[PDB]
Amino acid sequence: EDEDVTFNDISSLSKHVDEGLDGYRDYLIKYSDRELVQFFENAPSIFALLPAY
Amino acid sequence: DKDLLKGLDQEQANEVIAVLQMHNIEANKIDSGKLGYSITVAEPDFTAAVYWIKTYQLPPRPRVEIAQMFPADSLVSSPRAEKARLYSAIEQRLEQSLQTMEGVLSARVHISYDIDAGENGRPPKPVHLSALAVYERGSPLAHQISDIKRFLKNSFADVDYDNISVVLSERSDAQLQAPGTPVK
Amino acid sequence: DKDLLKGLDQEQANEVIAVLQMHNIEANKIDSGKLGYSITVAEPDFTAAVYWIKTYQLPPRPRVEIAQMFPADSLVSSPRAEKARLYSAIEQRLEQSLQTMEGVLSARVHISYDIDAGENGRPPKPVHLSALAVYERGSPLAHQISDIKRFLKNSFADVDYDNISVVLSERSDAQLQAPGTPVK
Amino acid sequence: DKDLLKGLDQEQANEVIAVLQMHNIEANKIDSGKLGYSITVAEPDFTAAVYWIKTYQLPPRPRVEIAQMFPADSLVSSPRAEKARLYSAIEQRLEQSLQTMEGVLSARVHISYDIDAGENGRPPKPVHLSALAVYERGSPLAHQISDIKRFLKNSFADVDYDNISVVLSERSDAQLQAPGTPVK
Amino acid sequence: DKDLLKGLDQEQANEVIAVLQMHNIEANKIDSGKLGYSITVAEPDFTAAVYWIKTYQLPPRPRVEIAQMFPADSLVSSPRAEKARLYSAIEQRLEQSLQTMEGVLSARVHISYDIDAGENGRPPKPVHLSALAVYERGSPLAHQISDIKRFLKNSFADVDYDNISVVLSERSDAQLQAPGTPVK
Amino acid sequence: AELDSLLGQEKERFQVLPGRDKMLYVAAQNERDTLWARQVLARGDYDKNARVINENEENKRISIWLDTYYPQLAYYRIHFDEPRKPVFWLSRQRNTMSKKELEVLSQKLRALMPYADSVNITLMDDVTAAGQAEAGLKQQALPYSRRNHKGGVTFVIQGALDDVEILRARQFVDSYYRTWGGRYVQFAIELKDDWLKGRSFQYGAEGYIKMSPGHWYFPSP
Amino acid sequence: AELDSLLGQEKERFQVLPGRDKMLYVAAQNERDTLWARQVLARGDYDKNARVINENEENKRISIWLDTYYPQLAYYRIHFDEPRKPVFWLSRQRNTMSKKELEVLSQKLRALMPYADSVNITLMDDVTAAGQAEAGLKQQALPYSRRNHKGGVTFVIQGALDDVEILRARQFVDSYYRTWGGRYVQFAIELKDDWLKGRSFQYGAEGYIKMSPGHWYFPSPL
Amino acid sequence: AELDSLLGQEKERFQVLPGRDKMLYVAAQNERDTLWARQVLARGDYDKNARVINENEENKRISIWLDTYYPQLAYYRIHFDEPRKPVFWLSRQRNTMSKKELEVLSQKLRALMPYADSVNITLMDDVTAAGQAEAGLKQQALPYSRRNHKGGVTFVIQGALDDVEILRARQFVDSYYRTWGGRYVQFAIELKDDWLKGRSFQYGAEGYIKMSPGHWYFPSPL
């Protein structure tokens, strides 16, 4: 809801949207193991976690 | 002729006599067949020998190993119960190899145990070692830290020289003369 | 000739005798075969001996360890019972290893039990140790508090020198002379 | 010659005699084999011995511990029962280790029990400890309260010094002389 | 003729006699058929013989290997327990090949154990070896550490010269003359 | 027989003094030998009367009389290093007594101690008593705070002390109470937990502690 | 039944001195031989009375007598290398006793020890006491922090020392306490977690500034 | 029933010297033969009095007496290659004892050794004691660091040494302590890993360690 997202750098607005998703990601990093998550990053990211979950 | 302990084991009675002979009192070891040995002491020495039984906590408990809490005959073996029976045998083989060095009479090694690294998503951590040794006297026991540290540093995958703690000391003065019988 | 206790154990009778001989009263260890030992004191020395039985809570109950509440013969074994059965063998092996240092007569070590933190998704908290020791007298026991901290600092995963508390003391004055029989 | 209590055991009878002997009345412990002990007093001291027994609520009931309410012989064991059987063996080992200090005659440790933190995903609260002790007289019992705090601080996960309360006290005056038989 | 040890076997009694004869006391090896061996010493040499038993930790335990914790008759064989027997037969074969060199009397080789490298997503770490040795007196033992460091390198996948640690030493002065009888 | 034969074998740890009121006095030096000698007289294998005295509980008995019949008296300790001529340690800068009433105080103490023959009264300065207590507390490198007032001085030892300093403190207070006693200078050892283990803070005149990136703590001066 | 026959076989680890109060003194050397000699006089296989002395406990007993009749006195140790003629090491720069009131102290110390014949008092310097404690601490390459004050000196060894510096420091302090004693100079070996072994700095605008020695230490992230 | 025949068959490892206090001293060479000969007298197959001496325990026994009656002395070692004429290696550039008052030291050292006939005190140089230690530490190619201070030098050998260098430093130090003692020069072997292992730092008078690409640390000047 905080509309203070607009800034000068293209990645500075990009890190802010990641901060919105770490609230969901902290649920998802809690239950999944440490074996598929880096296995699905060399071949944390969000998309590596759902099939491990 | 006052008995004070009975039913002991062979290695327990050799630890009781060598404690009493250090304090100028002599004891008699009497076998009883199936019911173990028994130690008797003289009547003027009974008051001192009970006080040294209380102080030194004799008779000694059998020495415990980590592989005794997880017997191999169990039907279900966890990864925790396999990792603990592995480290509890590396810990005995390393302290059995430390006794064949030049000057060591006894030693005791402790490997840090890791259990909670396998089941959850936490990565494992660096392993720590610790050692103890008793050297024959007349030896320069300050220069022999680097030989034990060098021997221990390459017996695991990744240890540093400040994660190994070696505490060693020289042995006590030797006891060679007899106690002597208490005359009256 | 008056009976105080009966049905004791071999290791339980030498503690009652070692306590009563400190307060100048004699005792007699009478065996009864299957019924156990028995301790008799004199009739003038019955009022003081009952008072020291009440004060010192004699005979001592057997010493408790955590591995007795979770026996290994169970059909199911939670990881809570496997970590408690593991930590209860580490704190017994460490206190048997503390008795081989130079000058130590007895010791006792406690580990901080953290059992549900590694199960839950929250990270496990730090581990704390604590130790007691009884030193042979004549020793400068202010310098030896750094050797015990160096020995058991590197025996676990990541402990600091602020999470280790060693409280040690020198032993009591020796009791060597006989008590003496009440003359009437 | 009149009896006032029968069927008592050994530890109960040894705490009834030690109560009556400090109030200048003499009791007699009579064995009865299978039926247990029995305690008889003289005839003029019977009105006072009944009064003292009622005030002290003799005979004393056996000590109750938390590990007895949840036996290990159950077929299913909840995690509330495994933590209740764990904390009740920790508070027994800490009080068996407090008696090995210098000057302590008795001790009693209490731990705060937390049972609802493990069933759900709430974080646990801090853990609180409380100790009692009885010291030998002639000891400076004002400076003995910092060693029990330092020993108790890092025997758990994370406590402060405001969650540990040690209340200790010197022992009572010694009773050493015989009561005295009533003339008639 | 006071006995001090009995019920031993063939390889333990030949060690106790070889240690006691080095310190100028003589022993007597008595066979007892199915009950093993026994060792008796003279009565003047009994006090010193108990002291060297307590000092040298006799009788020796049999040497342990890692392959005994995971026996072949265990028909459930984990992949965690198959590499432990593959490691434990390599370190048992490299030290049987080290004894056939020129001048080596005894040796011991330790290998780093990695068992969970197949189940996690991480690559395995390097291999760390370590070896002790004992040479004959009169050998140039400084230039013979490069044959062990060259032989140990390409006996595995990929180790470096800073991951191998060789701590070797010479043997003691030989004991050839007789201890001699205690003349009385 | 004699009293020294009903005691233990070693005739060195007990001193038997003849009294003046037809009684015998045994002078132990700690609690274990006091309980060793009281069991002899308590079980009753001796005809006449005897008593067991000590160092601590004899200094406690003649201070109950001396805080009733002579209040406002400034003293430290009564030393019994030799029991036939004890030394009475009075203060110098806090008493108003002349030559006569010190001898009168000596005559009223000789009647309280029948096993003694004379009582030697010396006067000690209150400056050296608080100087040796500060120099010994500075040599052990302990954190302390001195609080002066009239007729006493107190030292406060606070902070998050480790396990080495609480043994060095106990070995100093126990070696100092044996000499001077707790009548003048008092030690107050209290240990607290530390706030600033992982926090960042500004010290000096305007001090504060940042308990979080968004949390300031202004302690009171 | 002589006393030299009631001891062990080797009659060279004990030494029996005749007393003046008709009592024989046995001068042992350590605590292990002290209980070896107290057991003979405790079982009671000897006719007359005897006492066992020791270097460590006659110096603990004589300071209890000395700090009651001679307070504020500066001394170091009593040496018993020849027990019939001990040496009393007095401090020269910290007391102003005369010759006559040093001979009264030498006669009242003689009457306290009935086995001695004449106690010889030698005045040791006070600068070489703290000079050999610093020069012997620089030779082992140990980190230290000398703190001088009036009537004493203290050396503090903090930091996360490893196992060789702990062993050399403990091996040196035990060899210094035997010769001089801990009345004047005191050592303070203590372990805590900081990789800077005792010293600490603060950084602003000119480089680094050596801070004052204090009790608070900065924990080391490393 | 003589002592030289009551021992083993080879009549060359022990040597029996007559004393002056009616005792017989046996001089062993090392610790194993010392415990070989102390067992004979301890089991008690000999009537008269005897004692077993060594070289290390006799070099420590009269360095304890020489710490009580002759403090602040600078000496190295007492060699007992011929036990009837020992040699007392005194320092030359650190003592101030004259010719006449060096005679009473030899006449008091003769009384502590009843087997010796006369002690020969000779003066060894001081820069030749520290010159051979460095010229022997350079032939083994060991990285060292010399710390000169008043009344003793110190050689510190640190770093991550390999396995050959520990063997060579163990063979040279044990052959130098044998012939020079440990009073003047002391070696400090110290095996440790690289300080600030995987960290990048900016050394010299204004230092900072980089724990991370976005992290600075300002301890003591590295």
Say if domain H1-53 classifies as CATH 3.60.15.10. no
Strand order in the sheet with H16-18: H16-18, H24-27, H50-53
Helix (H, G, I), strand (E, B) or coil at G12: coil
User: How far, in Å, CA of E137 to CA of E115, rounded?
Assistant: 40
User: How far, in Å, CA of C25 to CA of C16, rounded?
Assistant: 11
CA terminus-to-terminus distance, chain D: 14
Beta bridge partner(s), residue D38: D6, D30
User: In which element (H, E) is residue D108 found?
Assistant: strand D104-111
Chain H residues touching residue G81 (CB < 8 angstroms): 64-65, 68-69
Segments in C21-132 forming alpha helices (H): 47-56, 79-98
CA distances from H62 to F123, G81, G129, H76 (A): 47, 11, 21, 12
Classify residue C10 as exposed, middle or buried by CB count within 10 Å of its CB (0-12, 13-18, 19+). Answer: middle
Segments in E57-144 forming alpha helices (H): 83-98
C58 φ/ψ angles, rounded to the nearest 5 degrees: -80, 145
User: In which element (H, E) is residue C16 found?
Assistant: helix C10-20
In this complex, is the C-beta atom of C57 within 8 Å of any C-beta atom belonging to chain G? no
E53 φ/ψ angles, rounded to the nearest 5 degrees: -70, -45
Contacts of B111 (CB under 8 A, 6+ apart): B87, B90, B91, B94, B127, B129
The angle at the Cα of F2, spanning F1 to F5, to the nearest 5 degrees, equals: 90
Q: Do the domains G125-194 and G1-53 match in fold?
A: yes
In the numeric block, which tokens belong to residue B162?
Answer: 């400040």
Chains touching chain C through at least 3 C-beta pairs below 8 angstroms are B, D, F, G
State how far residue H39 is from chain B, nearest Cα, in angstroms.
Answer: 7
* Structural domain spans, chain F: 1-53, 54-124, 125-194
Strands in chain F per DSSP E: 15-18, 24-27, 50-53, 75-79, 87-91, 120-124, 145-149, 152-157, 185-189, 200-202, 208-212, 215-217
In this complex, is the C-beta atom of D50 within 8 Å of any C-beta atom belonging to chain C? no
- H191 and H161 Cβ atoms separated by less than 8 Å: yes
Residue whose token pair is 């609080």: F147
Residue in H209, H196, H214, F212 with CA at minimum distance from that of residue G203: H209
Helix (H, G, I), strand (E, B) or coil at B32: coil
In this complex, is the C-beta atom of D118 within 8 Å of any C-beta atom belonging to chain C? yes
Helix (H, G, I), strand (E, B) or coil at D150: helix
What length is written for chain F?
221
Chain D residues touching residue F173 (CB < 8 angstroms): 140, 143
Q: Please state which architecture CATH assigns to domain H54-124.
A: 2-Layer Sandwich (3.30)
User: How far, in Å, CA of F132 to CA of G34, rounded?
Assistant: 34
Residue in F24, F78, F77, F84 with CA at minimum distance from that of residue F52: F24
In this complex, is the C-beta atom of E123 within 8 Å of any C-beta atom belonging to chain A? no
Beta-carbon-side half-sphere exposure of residue E54 (alpha carbons within 13 Å) = 23
By what technique were these coordinates determined?
A: cryo-EM
Beta-carbon-side half-sphere exposure of residue C110 (alpha carbons within 13 Å) = 30
User: How far, in Å, CA of H96 to CA of H73, rounded?
Assistant: 10
In this complex, is the C-beta atom of B21 within 8 Å of any C-beta atom belonging to chain E? yes
User: How far, in Å, CA of C17 to CA of F7, rounded?
Assistant: 20
Q: Do C178 and F167 touch (CB under 8 A)?
A: no
Residue in H139, H137, H132, H157 with CA at minimum distance from that of residue H147: H157
Contacts of C135 (CB under 8 A, 6+ apart): C103, C104, C105, C141, C144, C168, C169, C170, C171
Strand order in the sheet with D164-170: D104-111, D129-135, D164-170
In the numeric block, which tokens belong to residue F142?
Answer: 């302990």
State how far residue C94 is from chain G, nearest Cα, in angstroms.
Answer: 19
In the numeric block, which tokens belong to residue H13?
Answer: 């490892």
Residue in B97, B101, G175 with CA at minimum distance from that of residue H170: B101
CA distances from B32 to B10, E50, H211 (A): 12, 20, 69
**Nearest CB to G8 within list B22, B177, B183:** B177
In the numeric block, which tokens belong to residue C153?
Answer: 């600092």
- G135 and H151 Cβ atoms separated by less than 8 Å: yes
**Nearest CB to B55 within list C67, C82, C105:** C105
**Nearest CB to C176 within list G42, G170, G190:** G42
Residue in G68, G36, G63 with CA at minimum distance from that of residue G52: G36
Tell me how far the alpha carbon of residue E172 is from its chain's centroid: 16
Residue of chain G minimizing CA distance to B179: G8
User: How far, in Å, CA of G85 to CA of G106, rounded?
Assistant: 12
Q: Which amino acid is at D101?
A: M
- D79 and D71 Cβ atoms separated by less than 8 Å: no
- The CATH code belonging to domain F125-194 is 3.30.70.1770
Q: Residues E57, E60, E64, E68: what is their CA dihedral angle, to the nearest 10 degrees?
A: -120
Using left for φ > 0, alpha for ψ between -120 and 50, and beta otherwise, residue G62 falls in: alpha
Beta bridge partner(s), residue G17: G25
The DSSP secondary-structure symbol of G54 reads: -
- D40 and D62 Cβ atoms separated by less than 8 Å: no
Helix (H, G, I), strand (E, B) or coil at F120: strand
Pick from H46, H218, H220 the residue to mutate for testing the G interface (most G CBs within 10 Å): H220
Residue in G77, C58, C159, B60 with CA at minimum distance from that of residue H68: G77
Segments in C63-144 forming alpha helices (H): 79-98
Helix axes B46-56, C10-20, angle to 10 degrees: 110
Helix (H, G, I), strand (E, B) or coil at G65: helix
State how far residue H189 is from chain B, nearest Cα, in angstroms.
Answer: 7
Beta bridge partner(s), residue G188: G156
**Nearest CB to H163 within list E25, E141, E145:** E145
Q: Which amino acid is at B123?
A: P
Tell me how far the alpha carbon of residue E130 is from its chain's centroid: 14
Residue whose token pair is 């010396």: F122
Chains touching chain G through at least 3 C-beta pairs below 8 angstroms are B, C, F, H
Pick from E19, E20, E24 the residue to mutate for testing the H interface (most H CBs within 10 Å): E24
Q: Do H39 and E48 touch (CB under 8 A)?
A: yes
Residue in H70, H79, H72 with CA at minimum distance from that of residue H107: H70
Beta bridge partner(s), residue B41: B2, B27
Classify residue F138 as exposed, middle or buried by CB count within 10 Å of its CB (0-12, 13-18, 19+). Answer: middle
Q: Do C176 and G193 touch (CB under 8 A)?
A: no
In the numeric block, which tokens belong to residue H113?
Answer: 């050794």
Q: Return the CA Rg of chain A.
A: 14
User: How far, in Å, CA of C43 to CA of C28, rounded?
Assistant: 13
Residue in H155, D22, G41 with CA at minimum distance from that of residue F12: G41
Q: Are strands C28-31 and C37-41 parallel, antiparallel or unpaired?
A: antiparallel
The angle at the Cα of G138, spanning G135 to G140, to the nearest 5 degrees, equals: 120
- H94 and H126 Cβ atoms separated by less than 8 Å: yes
In the numeric block, which tokens belong to residue F64?
Answer: 């109950």
Helix (H, G, I), strand (E, B) or coil at F199: coil
Other CB atoms within 10 Å distance of the CB of residue H154 = 17
CA terminus-to-terminus distance, chain F: 72
Residue of chain D minimizing CA distance to C116: D118
C59 prior amide bond cis, ω within 30: yes
- C21 and C44 Cβ atoms separated by less than 8 Å: no
Residue of chain G minimizing CA distance to H189: G164
